[PDB]
């Protein structure tokens, strides 16, 4: 939306976020960085556990 001159080239200001898909991207990145991490840790645990189970054999 138009406003008073706020700088040499900035005559508009954010009025309404019609869709926040960029915010969704930021949140999903931040979440994923650790959400994948927990699954990776338990996957490594399972893999080494099956290694040990075969080692008993």
């Amino acid at each position: 939306e138009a406003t008073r001159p706020l700088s040499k080239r900035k005559f508009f200001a954010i009025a309404e976020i019609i869709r926040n898909k960029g915010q969704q991207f930021a949140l999903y990145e931040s979440e994923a960085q650790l959400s994948v991490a927990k699954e990776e840790a338990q996957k490594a645990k399972e893999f080494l556990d099956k290694r040990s189970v075969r080692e008993n054999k």
Partner: peptide
């Protein structure tokens, strides 16, 4: 009216 065709800043903006 505020929306796709809107004239003013939204509530939380």
């Amino acid at each position: 009216p505020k929306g796709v065709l809107g004239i003013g800043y939204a509530k939380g903006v």
